Every structure is written in structure tokens, then in C-alpha cells.
Amino acid sequence: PRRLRVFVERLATALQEANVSAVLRWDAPEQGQEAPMQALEYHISCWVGSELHEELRLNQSALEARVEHLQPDQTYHFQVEARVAATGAAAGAASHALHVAPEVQAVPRVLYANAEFIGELDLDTRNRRRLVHTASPVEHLVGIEGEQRLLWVNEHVELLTHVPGSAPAKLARMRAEVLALAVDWIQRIVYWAELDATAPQAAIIYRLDLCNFEGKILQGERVWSTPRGRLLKDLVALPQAQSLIWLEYEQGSPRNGSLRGRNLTDGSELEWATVQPLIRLHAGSLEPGSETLNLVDNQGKLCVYDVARQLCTASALRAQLNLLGEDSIAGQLAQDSGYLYAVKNWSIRAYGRRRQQLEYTVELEPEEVRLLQAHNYQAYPPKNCLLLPSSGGSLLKATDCEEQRCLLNLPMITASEDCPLPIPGVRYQLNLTLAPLGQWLLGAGESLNLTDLLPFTRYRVSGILSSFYQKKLALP
Amino acid sequence: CQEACLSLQFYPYDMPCIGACEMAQRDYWHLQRLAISHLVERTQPQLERPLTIRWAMHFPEHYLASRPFNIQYQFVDAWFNLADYDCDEYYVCEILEALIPYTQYRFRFELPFGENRDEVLYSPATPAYQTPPEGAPISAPVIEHLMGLDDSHLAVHWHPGRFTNGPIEGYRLRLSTSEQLVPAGRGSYIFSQLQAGTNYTLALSMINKQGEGPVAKGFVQTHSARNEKPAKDLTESVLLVGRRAVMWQSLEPAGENSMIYQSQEELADIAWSKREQQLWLLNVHGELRSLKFESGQMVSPAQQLKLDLGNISSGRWVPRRLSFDWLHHRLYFAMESPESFQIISTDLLGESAQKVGESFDLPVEQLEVDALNGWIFWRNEESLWRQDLHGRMIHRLLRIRQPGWFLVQPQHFIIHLMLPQEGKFLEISYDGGFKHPLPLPPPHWQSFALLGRSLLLPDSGQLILVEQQGQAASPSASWPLKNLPDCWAVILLVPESQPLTSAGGKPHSLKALLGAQAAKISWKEPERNPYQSADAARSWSYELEVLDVASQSAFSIRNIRGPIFGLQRLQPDNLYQLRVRAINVDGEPGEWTEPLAARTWPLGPHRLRWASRQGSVIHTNELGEGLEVQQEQLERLPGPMTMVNESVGYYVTGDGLLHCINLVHSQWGCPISEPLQHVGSVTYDWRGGRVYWTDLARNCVVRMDPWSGSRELLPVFEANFLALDPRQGHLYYATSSQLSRHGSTPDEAVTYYRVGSIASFVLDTQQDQLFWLVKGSGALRLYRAPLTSLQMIQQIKGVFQAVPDSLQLLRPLGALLWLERSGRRARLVRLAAPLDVMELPTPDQASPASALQLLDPQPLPPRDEGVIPMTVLPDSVRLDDGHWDDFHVRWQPSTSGGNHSVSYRLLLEFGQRLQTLDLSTPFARLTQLPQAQLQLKISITPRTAWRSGDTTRVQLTTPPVAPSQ
Ligand SMILES: *[C@@H]1O[C@H](CO[C@@H]2O[C@@H](C)[C@@H](O)[C@@H](O)[C@@H]2O)[C@@H](O[C@@H]2O[C@H](CO)[C@@H](O)[C@H](O)[C@H]2NC(C)=O)[C@H](O)[C@H]1NC(C)=O
Ligand SMILES: *[C@@H]1O[C@H](CO)[C@@H](O[C@@H]2O[C@H](CO)[C@@H](O)[C@H](O)[C@H]2NC(C)=O)[C@H](O)[C@H]1NC(C)=O
Ligand SMILES: *[C@@H]1O[C@H](CO)[C@@H](O)[C@H](O)[C@H]1NC(C)=O
Ligand SMILES: *[C@@H]1O[C@H](CO)[C@@H](O)[C@H](O)[C@H]1NC(C)=O
Ligand SMILES: *[C@@H]1O[C@H](CO)[C@@H](O)[C@H](O)[C@H]1NC(C)=O
Ligand SMILES: *[C@@H]1O[C@H](CO)[C@@H](O)[C@H](O)[C@H]1NC(C)=O
Ligand SMILES: *[C@@H]1O[C@H](CO)[C@@H](O)[C@H](O)[C@H]1NC(C)=O
Ligand SMILES: *[C@@H]1O[C@H](CO)[C@@H](O)[C@H](O)[C@H]1NC(C)=O
Ligand SMILES: *[C@@H]1O[C@H](CO)[C@@H](O)[C@H](O)[C@H]1NC(C)=O
Ligand SMILES: *[C@@H]1O[C@H](CO)[C@@H](O)[C@H](O)[C@H]1NC(C)=O
């Protein structure tokens, strides 16, 4: 007999409230082959405690329903009765009670990329889709899932994107071997790493802003670089910690992995302490205040790194992942908010985070998965933090002027003291006037340099501030 | 039933249709629960292993009409709801909840029947299933007791935590650093070699096979360092007792090595007193010579004291040992049979003899008593034992071959024992599980003495003063002992050898129950450590202060011989700070407690009405004294009594029955003859003069005139508790889920709260606020909202909760009262100080309490004729029609006494055609006029917000209607 399978999902769009909803999937009861396919009328009663929340009546061949507007940290009771719709005879009944807990529960869907396409593999229904058909195969794949955007690097070394309902748009073309790829989903910055092929080989971290993309091919900017003779692997962007964490290894010693990173605001180098040298790093929980990392050391064991305490953390999934072997835990490992996925012996295994057990095991073809990625919960800031700030203030700070030119610094703006994260897509626009002489549309982080100014002469700059989201909402 | 019984004539609520639908549905679910109750309560759910409960039942036929069934779980060592489970129609349930590992569980089913909260069934519990062990422990090990024994040692006793999450292996102790692992069977550790007079911090953790648990934190002082007297300033005195020569000696550099007593017979044992200074001498033949001395010389000779044998003593018993209790003034004897050693305690006269323990064949070498810590110790050649003074509990400390003479320090709690066969130092604690070595200087001494950090070892010619690290060949001072052959007993004559002072005390858990001019206060005694017994004495006098914050004046009263104190003569409506300490016999008091803000009641005859579970009713004051047993007899389990006038009261019992009682004259006064079933609560409007109750079977509110018994159904649905504001006529009601307001118009209906469930509420009409209790999952959460900012005032956690409909508002104090569900306590929370929860105990004549009310000092006001609508004049009801389609009825407008808003309800009868209107003007337009000259019947019901006037019924002839368009 086929049981009622309910999964809660928490879907968060930027400038919108997170919505937590319950997806119910129930298979049909077994019918004879002489009888045709029958309509099953599914009656659901959702209960909060002793009161009734929602009630839906659906004519479906198999139950695929969605209860909206659930609240976190509360026990719900879904009572489903299945009748045959033509006759009224009761096919079955089910009663699922569910504490919600959206940080440990999600829908088991992965994004898999072979040489032909990028698809979604739902591990419950064992069904495969195709989101985008690729002419050339995918080497690295990250995503922004508030707007369902896929960002990937092809074999011809080009960085591309996909929104549903359009063509694959070309974002960048670069001329070296890309070692790793990451995205900050809040500020819409794509970071990657390129191989530098001098005789001490290095890797340079390039960034691109998605708010500056209007349909033509952009070019990346060098932000940081590693020390010479060392190389990068497995770039993970932590936006709420404002960090960029990679595995820095030395060329010739790939099993000496050390957890290195940069700080995303001021560019300062940061170090994280491990008890053993590493081979592989994967992204973790990505929840604010409880960010983890799944990281594999040189003996093929895993720690769940808590990055605030900077320590390994014991869990019940750790021995079950270490029983699979080194090649399975080092090749493909992904983690969303609800599950944790590994590939071993042409089969994808999903381990639940709440129950700490093996939940799903789905067999594959020998070339169906080359890259695995998960729908991890990208926690967005609130609506005052993402948008343009109300108060103007003295954001423009004058430096020490020479007689010929002044180096006006353009810093990066947070909206209030309640918003610790930077505002996405910040563009200053400046007139220069003699207290126009010059017009600039310039982003945050760089400086304006202000040549051909007269000595012993007052000057004025005036500017409006714009963000990506105030252009999207058409706010003034 | 509101949507099923929807009619276009009686709108918006066809009230008897809704009441008949709701009463038929509760009768249906009552008959279904009475049908399936035996099959639920016989059938046990079975567990199998995802974890799966199989219950031998089925879902009901109207399965979606009922509430959700709940699987409930219980720890084996209350029932909480399981959150994650998956059941099909044959109850083959799969638990998806992350259970606590290595915890045994029991599971059961809860089947509700409809929306009624009374009709639940509980299945029997499962056989007990333990979760398999995995992971680190999540519970810190809670320490029981943690104290400094002396300046160098530290003792801790603990128990394991609740969720061990595995089989227990070892506990880790960290002292700040000193770390130590101890195995699973031991739960007591004593450290050593600590610094004197600093506090240490102890960190205790639990270790199983998988990992290490959380860390328990402790702050604990050692004892301060004793003053070290040198050899030049040693002012002590010793009494060395040999078998044939007893000599008292001064430990000065100019010491007198002076004879006190010579006995030619060999003495078996001595007993030494401190205030009396008496050396009892028991010889080898068994006769006792009581010998009083004074400061090392004779003041009285030896007297032969005869012990009574009695009917306990059947055979011959020859005494050998002696020990003298300095608290009880009683001796303890070990006796020899001429065939076993049995120890009999006796008085100083020797007549009141009673045995302790059982007889054993081993010979007792020394009997010593800790009278302060309540222990008698007997040492034999096989073991050292420990007994309490009443002989209740028996313990053996250490087994060893042939131990020597041990010395008990009471305030160090360490037995120091010296085998002459070993020649090395041994420290035993009072539980006997701690055995420790120390360095000893080499010589074999039969006895010793301990003086601070110094050690006195008697030689055959001299005495050796060492500090247990310097050599015995070079003592710091020497005193000659040349007339003594051997030294079996050395007694140090200090007051610290036999102290009456326990040297530890700090009272706690101070509780003050306050009145207008008095206060009853109780504090907990400081608890006993495991090192002393139940026969240990800590007889104290407690000193209590009242600090007035108005005058900032501290008054202290001392010599209170018990933990309870009835303090009198307080000025009313005043706040103080009350603090207690414990003073010993020696006059060294304890530390201060934390003060509590203790506000008195205001001045007035403030009487509380208590009602039992047996129907007895008593009137106390606010302290619970001054009781008057009232004349009337209530029924079983009554609720709070609602008074209409001063003779007639109404109450609800525990089974939902509503009862009227006339207190003064019982032959008349109640308009309803029988009790009425299924009633939630009851209240009364004095201004309208109407009794409002919730009929739970009709989920309605019934309003009754108390002078006539005429009942009106009123459209408030699913309500349990009512309170009506008499100023505006607004009814305030609380459901199980929500709390809200009903007015005369639908615009005045406002919802204050939606959720556990609301247990009781109370309305504050004067200050325009409202309070309610939410009885959640083990936490009573009290709230406050204005009548036009919702905050949680106080959350009380625990398994004890409130009686439903038991929150009253103490107006003079400005507090909230609720009776607890056990019926032996009430809790009171003031509004100015939210954090203090005083408890009122219940008087013992009505020992389970079911109701507590604050009686008002003023009488209840009479009914108001200013809210009664006047009757509509039947001559003034005119059917005057205008031009076009304006065919309307008007009347003279009904007023009230005070000028209140009078609305109208109107009924038209065109024969069999019916039309109802709800009106706010003296005016009604008739629409579907039948034009053929009928006799219209018009009935008018005027009303106000509080009550309704009489019905005016007229019959009018229709005017002729010629156009039909
Ligand atoms: C779910 O379906 C039932 C049954 O649908 C009928 O039978 C199917 C095999 C198919 O042929 C359908 O088109 C038929 O309607 C619905 O019940 C019917 O509902 C309509 C609308 O109220 C009513 O007139 C009919 O009498 C009903 N028929 C029976 C046999 O009960 C039902 O309403 C559907 N549920 C929903 C939410 O649409
Ligand atoms: C309190 O009110 C009640 C009415 O609710 C009064 O009871 C009536 O008393 C008279 C005189 O004894 C009887 O004839 C009536 O039958 C009673 N009324 C009913 C409805 O039964 C009672 O007298 C009042 N008490 C006082 C002191 O006023
Ligand atoms: C969430 O709800 C909003 C409306 O409040 C809706 O616009 C958005 O598409 C929803 N996202 C989903 C599908 O979860
Ligand atoms: C691994 O790298 C660390 C950090 O640079 C270094 O100290 C160590 O020697 C390396 N170990 C080996 C075996 O190369
Ligand atoms: C990154 O920089 C910001 C701004 O100075 C600072 O608050 C933050 O602590 C830095 N982050 C880390 C992880 O050090
Ligand atoms: C691994 O996969 C192959 C595919 O044919 C199969 O034969 C084999 O049994 C698998 N091994 C295990 C341990 O499942
Ligand atoms: C001039 O402009 C560039 C481009 O932003 C900037 O990097 C640089 O710091 C400026 N200032 C100098 C050279 O002082
Ligand atoms: C700069 O000046 C031009 C000319 O008036 C104007 O179009 C433009 O909007 C100005 N920029 C800003 C930020 O005001
Ligand atoms: C130990 O000293 C600290 C330092 O202030 C203090 O907090 C604590 O109360 C002391 N502990 C005891 C048991 O006296
Ligand atoms: C009510 O109205 C009447 C008529 O206007 C008036 O005389 C009277 O003062 C009003 N107030 C009261 C309290 O009766």
C-alpha cells in the first residue's frame, strides 16, 4: 500500500515574504487491468490544533496538491480521504501530522547536469525534467532560486544564464580554465576563479554583477588573487556572513587543503581552522546564524563545519556518509535545507537532515549525473534592507584633495542600522559642477578620480542613488 | 449549523434551528463515544520496528467531521502530543518524529468526537519501547551537593541526567586545572591539595561510548586557612590515657607533665566530656567507674555505675567500649557474650538502655561518636562501620586487616586513620568510598593527635611534633612522657574536638503571604549534606527583618524557633522587603537572603469565599484565617457563585449542571425548578438585571430574567465564559480558541485574541482593561489587553495548572487569583510587580477547593429602570402610506428612563406570508404588499443594549393599492 507523502517547502523571493507551503503527493490505490483509469476525488482537511485551516476538493488520478500559507514551528494535521469520484466508494484514507520546521525539511529535488542538458530530478516521484538544453557540456553550476535563475560555465569556457521562459543568455566569455564558481544571491554577484598559467601557477578571482546585464556580453573584474604556487577549488559564497570561502591547495599537493577566504565588504583575507588537511568542500545549511560546510579531509571523512564556532560538529549523518567511501563523498555532494545528497555506484542517495536517516535511493544510468546541485534555501533580507534607503545622509566622503584632482571614494551603502547586509545593485549617478562638467553612472566599490580641476577652486558634486530593486519596483 | 440553518425570513441567525442542529450533533457524538468506548479501552496498540504502531481499529464513517486523533507519548522514567506521524485507515501508523535516543517510551491514541472537548477517548498505553542509543548526551549532570570539606579538599555528590543518550561510561570533572575521570557506578568525588581561601570552579560532564555531554557549572569556596601556632606559642593541653597510667600534659615550652589518675586494673576504654570534663573508665571485667576531673586533676573520685540490663538483655553481656554523645548526653556501649558484639545506647543514669544494630562476632577496638554529624562509628579488625544514632541506616566504610586508632574531625568530615602495621597515612571520608594517602614521618605508634596542620606522635619517652613532611628525628618541640609504658589513647582537649556548631547555614525559598495588618512567613531550612545523618542536630534561631521602603527603616526580630512565623502589626497598603537569616547556638548568623517586594493588602474587611469539592462553603479573610462556616450546603464540585441579589445565588457544578440557591429562605426564590444541563459558566448583569450563561449543548448564550425565568437565546456562538460591561451593554466572551466582544450592533464586534486554550478571563470595567489565562502545553500564560497593546504578563511553567473559570480580579489589592487544579493552592499575581507569584494555602476543613471568590464590601446595586424600554403605544402604530411605492408603518418612538438607544424588531404577517425586519428608527417600509385588502399583523419588540421591552401586537387593515407595476 502506498502512503501519503507530505513535504513542506519554504520559497523565498526577494522583495516578497517567504511563503511556506505543503506539497502532498499520494499515489493511487491498485486497480485492475480490465478497469480503466478512474477519477479519485481527494478531500483534504487541514487542521491547526482544533480549528480548520483549509479544505480542498480535487478530481485527480493521483494526488498532487499544495496547501498554502503554513506557519513555522506549529503542528498541522492533514486528513485526506480518497473516494472514487464516479461511484462514491471510498478508495482510502490517510492522516499525516506534521511539525513544520522549515530549516530541516524540503522537497527532495536536485539539479543534475550531464553532457546534453540540465534537468531536475525529483527523488520522491523518480521523475526527470529538462530545464535547459546545452549545446556544450556544463562544468560548474550554481543558481539563484528566488527568480529561478541558473548560472553555469560551459566547456567552451563561457558563463551563461537561464530564466524560465527565455533563451540561454550569454553573460561572459573568458580565456582561461575556470576552477570554481559561486554566486552571492543577495547582491547578485557571480564570483569565479581562473587559472593563471605563469611558472608559479595561480588563480585569480573574477566577479560580475548581474544588475549590469542588459542583454550583451559583460566582462569580469579582478578582485583578489591567491599567493603564487597555490590554487583554488570549490568556491562557496556566504552572503550573510559576508565571506568567500574556498579550499586553497598548493600545486602538486591536492590533499593539502586549507580553508581560506576573503571578506566581501572590505576585502580582508580570512582564515578558518581545520584539524586536518582537506580534499573537497561543499556548501552547507546557508541559514542565518547557523551556516555550515560539508568538508572532507585527506582520510576521506566528513566534518559538518560550524563556521561561527569554526569547528567540526558531530551528527548522526556523519558515520553513514563516511561508510560510503572516499570517492562517493569526494565526487558529488549537495545539500539543500531538507536533505543531503551523495552519488555512489550509479545511484543518488538522499539522507534526511531531521530524521538523520537514509530516506531515498534512486538508481541512475551510468552517464545521467555529472554534476549535482541542490535547491538550497537562499534566505533573503527583509524589504527595507534590499531596497533603497529612506534617509540620504553623508554617504559621500571627501578625501584629501590635491590641486589637480580629488579621489572621491564611492563606498557601499547599507539601508539602516537594522540592515547589516549591503544593498544590491547600487549605482550612483553624478553631475560635477563648478561651485554639467561631468556625468557618471558608476557602481559601488570603486572611486571617481576627477581630473582637470582648477587649483584653489571650489567644486561641487551632486548625485542620485539608485538600486536594482527600485528600478524593478519603479520606486522614485 | 449556522450555514445549514440559513433562512431568508429570520436573518442572520435562525436561532432554534441552530440550537436544534448543535444539540443533535452533540447527542450524535455522545452516542458514538458511548458506542465505541469499550472497544477503544480494551484494545492495546502494539509497537513494531521506521517505528510503527499497529492499533486494531478503523477510522469512523464520518471521518472528516471529527477532530484529529492524536498519538500521545509518555516518558516511562504527563502525556504530550506527538508531532509527526503517518496513519492510514487501518491505524498502521509510522512515527516520523525524531525521538530522544536511549529513552523508554509509551504511546497511546486520543480520539476526539466532534468539536466538543469533553468527548475524548484514550487508548491504553503501549508496551515500553526504548530508543536505540546514538550520539552525544544532551543533558548536563545535575550536581546534588558541592562543598569544601576543609582548606585542602573539596567534595561533590551528583546524580546522572535525564537523557543519557547511551549506556553510561564515565563522568569527567574539571576543577579550576585539575581533571579526573570517574566510572559509571560512582557519583561522588573528593579532590585534594587545593589552595586555601579561594573559590574553585567545578565543571562536570557526562561521557558515554559515543561522546561527551554538556558541562555543568559550579562555584565553591574552600575553608579558610587555620592559624598556625608555633612551638613557642603552643598553648594547648593533651590528656594521654594509657592502660595503667593516665596523665595530663601541657604543650607549652614550660609544660607541667602532671599526674591525674593511676589505675592498677587495666582499663578497656574511656569516654571523655568537654563541659563536664569527665573521663568514664570501663575496665576489662565490665564494671564502669565514672570519674569526674577538672583541668587535669582530681575534683571527684571514681563512682561505680551499674547499667540496667532489662528485657532486651536476655543473656550475659560484658561491656568493653565507651563513647559519649555531647548533644544527647547519652552513652553507647559494646558488650561481649560468653559463648558476639552488640551495641546498646544508654542514659547517664544507665537505666534507659536500648540496642542498636545486630550482633556480630568481630571485636570492636574503638567506639567513637560524631554527635554533631549524628554518627556512631565502630571499628573492628575486619572493617570500619558507620551507623546513625537511632540505628536506622547501616553502612560499612572500609575493609582492611587490623586497623589502628582513628580520629574523627566533625567540621572537616574526614576520618583520619592510622594503621601501625602499615606506617602510612590514611584519609577516609564519611561515605567510605574515598581513601587517600599522605606523607608520614617514619618512627610504631598506637595513637596520635592532630592539631591544625601539626601532628603529635607519642614516643615512649618523649612526644614528637611534626607537620607530616618534616622528619620525626628533629621535632619542633618535645615534651617528656617517661612515666607512660605505652600510649593507646591521646585526647586533644580543645573545644573544636566536640563542637556544637555545624558551621554552615543559609536559608532559602522564603515565602510571604500578606494580609492587611499581618503576614504569615515560611522559609525552607538549609538542607542536609550526605556526610551527616538524619540524627544530626542543626537547632537554630531565625532572625527576620522588615525593611520599610516608605521610611527606609529596618526592624529585626530574632529568636524564632521554627520556620513558620506569624508576623503581626503591619500598616496597610505598604510595601516592604523581608529577609531572613539563621543564627546558631554560638551566635554566628547566616548570610542575607534576596529580598522580595512584599506589599500588604489595603485596610478593610476583605473576606474570601472558599467552596470545597464536597459543597461546604467557608468565609476566611485574605490570610486564610478567621473562618465562619456558612449555613448553606452546595452540591458536589461547584464553581464560582454568581449573586443576583443578596439572597439568591447561581452556580455551575463540575458536570455542567446549573443550580440556583436561596441562601436566606429556601422555600421560594428560584424561578427555574430543575437544574439545567451542559452549562459552561454563568454571570449576571446588574444594570439590565439579566443572568447570562453559555449553553454548551446549543453553543449559545442564554439570557434569563431572574424574576420570571423567561429565557432568550442570544446570538453568541461557541462561547464558554462570559463577562458583560454594564456601562455600554457589551458582552465579552471567550471560546476555546478566541476571545472577543459582542455588542448591540455588528460594528462593535472586535476580536481581541486568537490562540493551548483560554482557561478563564475577567473583565476590568473601571480601568478599561481585560486579562485572560492561556493554558498551553505546561505553561500558564497570563495576558492583558485594553478595551479599545497585547502583552504577556507572567508565564508559569509546570505540570500544575488552573481550574477553568477560576481567574478572579482582586480589586482592593489589584491582583489576579486563580485556584490550582489540585485544589490545595491558589496563586496570586499583583499588577505592579508581575514577577512575584504568592501562593495562598487552602484551609483544611474544605481540603480540596473547587471555588474561590473575593466578596465585595459594598452590596450589589439594584436593577435599573433607566435601561428598560417603554412599551410602544398600540394606538400610535399607523399604516400611513404616501405617494408612489412608499407603503410604510410608523409608531411613536419608545424611549427609556435614561436616554439610551432603543432599537426595534418587527414582524409582518400577510396571512401566511412572513417578513422580519431589524430596525433602528420608528419606521418600516413594506415591500411585497399583496394589494387585496388583508389584515396585516404587526408585532413590535423594542430593545436596548441591556434588555428588551414588551411586545406590541396590532392588526391593521391595508390601504387599497390600485396600480401594479
Ligand atoms: C469530482 O468529480 C465528481 C464526479 O464527476 C463526474 O464523474 C466523472 C467520472 C466525470 O465524468 C465528471 O465529468 C462528472 O461530473 C463531481 O461530482 C459531480 O459534481 C457536479 C457539480 O456539482 C454535479 O452536478 C454532479 O451531480 C456530481 N456527480 C456525481 C456522480 O456525484 C465532483 O463535483 C468533482 N469535484 C469537484 C471539486 O469538481
Ligand atoms: C432576591 O430576589 C428573588 C427573585 O429573584 C426574590 O424571590 C422572590 O421572593 C418572593 C417573596 O419571598 C416570592 O414570593 C417569590 O416567589 C420569589 N421569586 C421567585 C421568582 O421565585 C427574593 O425575595 C429577593 N430577596 C430579597 C431580600 O429581596
Ligand atoms: C508567494 O506568495 C506570493 C503572494 O504573497 C506570490 O506572489 C508568490 O508567487 C508566491 N510564491 C510561491 C509560488 O511560493
Ligand atoms: C600541509 O600544509 C601545511 C600548511 O602549509 C604545512 O605546514 C604542512 O607541512 C603540509 N604538509 C605536508 C605533508 O606537505
Ligand atoms: C567583514 O567586514 C565587516 C565590515 O567591517 C565586519 O563587520 C565583519 O565582521 C567582517 N566579517 C568577518 C567574517 O570577519
Ligand atoms: C553497483 O552497481 C552494479 C551495476 O551493475 C551492480 O552490479 C552492483 O551490484 C552494485 N553494487 C552494490 C553494492 O549495490
Ligand atoms: C583612480 O581610479 C581608479 C579606478 O577606480 C582607482 O583604482 C584608483 O584608486 C584611483 N586613485 C588613485 C590612483 O589615486
Ligand atoms: C546631470 O545633469 C544633466 C543635465 O541637466 C541631467 O540630465 C542629469 O539628470 C543630471 N544627473 C543627476 C544625477 O541629476
Ligand atoms: C567566588 O568569588 C567570585 C568573584 O567575585 C564570586 O562571584 C563568587 O560569589 C564567590 N563564590 C563563593 C562560593 O563565595
Ligand atoms: C433624557 O431626556 C429628557 C427629554 O429630553 C430630559 O428631560 C432628561 O434630562 C434626559 N436625561 C435623563 C438622565 O433623564
Side-chain angles (χ1 to χ4, degrees), chain A residues 5 7 108 123-124 126 339 348-350 358-362:
Chain A
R5 315 176 305 260
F7 316 105
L123 295 177
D124 191 32
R126 293 176 172 86
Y339 289 89
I348 171 168
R349 285 176 170 87
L358 172 69
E359 306 256 18
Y360 294 102
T361 296
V362 165

Side-chain angles (χ1 to χ4, degrees), chain A residues 429-431 436 439 462-464:
Chain A
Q429 179 181 324
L430 276 297
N431 308 119
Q439 273 172 322
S462 81
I464 63 166

Side-chain angles (χ1 to χ4, degrees), chain A residues 75-217:
Chain A
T75 301
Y76 285 75
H77 293 247
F78 306 101
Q79 311 260 6
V80 182
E81 202 186 26
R83 290 166 307 270
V84 192
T87 73
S95 173
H96 191 108
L98 186 148
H99 201 45
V100 175
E103 300 95 16
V104 292
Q105 284 184 166
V107 181
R109 291 191 297 245
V110 300
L111 293 173
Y112 70 102
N114 57 5
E116 319 165 37
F117 64 100
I118 299 175
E120 208 178 23
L121 171 55
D122 187 17
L123 295 177
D124 191 32
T125 56
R126 293 176 172 86
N127 261 325
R128 284 148 177 83
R129 279 169 45 194
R130 175 215 278 131
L131 281 75
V132 61
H133 181 88
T134 55
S136 64
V138 186
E139 297 275 334
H140 313 275
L141 169 70
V142 294
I144 306 181
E145 301 163 1
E147 55 186 2
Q148 289 164 334
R149 162 178 313 271
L150 299 187
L151 307 152
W152 74 94
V153 171
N154 278 317
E155 272 198 353
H156 323 311
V157 193
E158 286 157 354
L159 189 150
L160 270 76
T161 181
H162 178 263
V163 190
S166 84
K170 286 198 93 60
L171 265 165
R173 164 171 299 105
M174 72 291 291
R175 287 159 272 277
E177 178 181 346
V178 164
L179 301 177
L181 181 73
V183 55
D184 198 299
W185 66 85
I186 297 172
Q187 273 88 45
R188 298 166 44 96
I189 313 179
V190 179
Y191 304 94
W192 66 92
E194 297 192 30
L195 197 78
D196 194 17
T198 61
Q201 291 200 359
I204 316 172
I205 300 176
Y206 287 78
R207 92 178 172 189
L208 191 137
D209 212 321
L210 296 178
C211 312
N212 308 351
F213 177 58
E214 310 97 348
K216 42 183 149 284
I217 303 176

Side-chain angles (χ1 to χ4, degrees), chain B residues 750-789:
Chain B
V750 58
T751 298
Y752 299 118
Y753 193 63
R754 289 182 183 91
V755 301
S757 60
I758 302 174
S760 190
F761 84 108
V762 65
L763 181 58
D764 195 12
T765 80
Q766 303 176 0
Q767 277 75 23
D768 290 334
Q769 60 208 355
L770 202 156
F771 320 102
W772 63 98
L773 272 182
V774 176
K775 181 200 303 306
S777 63
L780 303 92
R781 313 183 268 170
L782 191 152
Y783 288 87
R784 186 210 88 96
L787 291 196
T788 77
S789 66

